[PDB]
């Protein structure tokens, strides 16, 4: 059937000239509201949460492991790098590149948490280990987000990503102490306020990783907190025809305020 968020969802992406792509899953009772949810998109930057949680999951059987120092050469910064080009010639933790591929997306540390799992593939391993037997990761940063619609490299689901982060945030795959790390990344995010959380009651609170890339890519994952109520796992993709496309967030934005009016 269609429901009626889901024909408001269709009427959004339909003025919004992309495709769009919806997965909810409501913790209160288990439902899912989906909107092109088996449908491939690419990640972009929302991969880093699998990548950070794969190393959260290593860090269980290690307790010094996020304390381990990685060295940063100049080679290493890519297209976006703000927290690791302040430490070229020395070093960070697994902690530090965690914590600053999720909140302020720095692209440098990303390839260092792949690296650590010993390439893409060690993310997708991951991922499979948890039960996702969609997500793919095939790059490392920056190419990871070409975002060419068809490619199936580096792409996942709404519906997988949404069991994905719930399992991850609220669920058991990680460790309890993990799990609260990475909820605490999440909820410190710097880049969501115009994406999920933007179509939201402002009194919710939201933890969220973005992305965007090529194609207009505007993507963005999120667990919310809301007023008086269980929480709520959200999955917002979205990508265009041109590859010079512009980033939309308000279409995120519009999206999660359709998809909060039908709970
Ligand atoms: C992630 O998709 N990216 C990293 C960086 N930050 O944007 S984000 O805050 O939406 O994640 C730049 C854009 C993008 C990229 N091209 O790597
Ligand atoms: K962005
Ligand atoms: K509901
Ligand atoms: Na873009």
New binding site residues.
């Given amino acids: 059937q269609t429901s009626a968020v889901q024909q408001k969802l269709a009427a959004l992406e339909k003025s919004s000239g992309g495709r769009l792509g919806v997965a909810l899953i409501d913790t209160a009772d288990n439902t899912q509201v989906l909107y092109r949810g088996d449908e491939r998109f690419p990640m ?3 991969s ?1 949460v699998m990548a950070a949680a794969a190393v959260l999951k290593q860090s269980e059987t290690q307790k010094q492991l996020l304390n381990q120092p990685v060295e940063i050469k100049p080679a290493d910064l890519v ?2 790098n703000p927290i690791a080009e302040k430490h070229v010639n020395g070093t960070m933790t697994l902690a530090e590149l965690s914590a600053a591929a999720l909140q302020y ?1 720095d ?1 440098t540390a990303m390839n260092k948490l792949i690296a650590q799992l010993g390439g893409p593939g060690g993310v997708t391993a991951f991922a499979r280990a948890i039960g996702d037997e969609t997500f793919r990761l095939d790059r490392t ?2 190419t990871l ?1 070409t975002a060419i619609p068809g490619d199936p490299r580096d792409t996942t689901t709404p519906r997988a990503m949404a069991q994905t982060l719930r399992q991850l945030t609220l669920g058991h795959a990680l460790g309890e102490t993990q799990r609260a790390q990475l909820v605490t990344w999440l909820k410190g995010n710097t ?1 969501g306020a115009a994406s999920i959380r933007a179509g939201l009651p402002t009194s919710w609170t939201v933890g969220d ?5 090529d194609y207009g890519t505007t ?1 963005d994952i999120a667990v919310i907190w809301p007023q008086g109520r269980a929480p709520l796992v959200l999955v917002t993709y979205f990508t265009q025809p041109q590859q010079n496309a512009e980033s939309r967030r308000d279409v995120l934005a519009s999206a999660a305020r359709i998809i909060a009016e039908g709970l």
């Fill in positions: 972009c930057s929302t880093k297209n976006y997306s692209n940063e920056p987000n880049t990783k973005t992305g965007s890339g993507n």
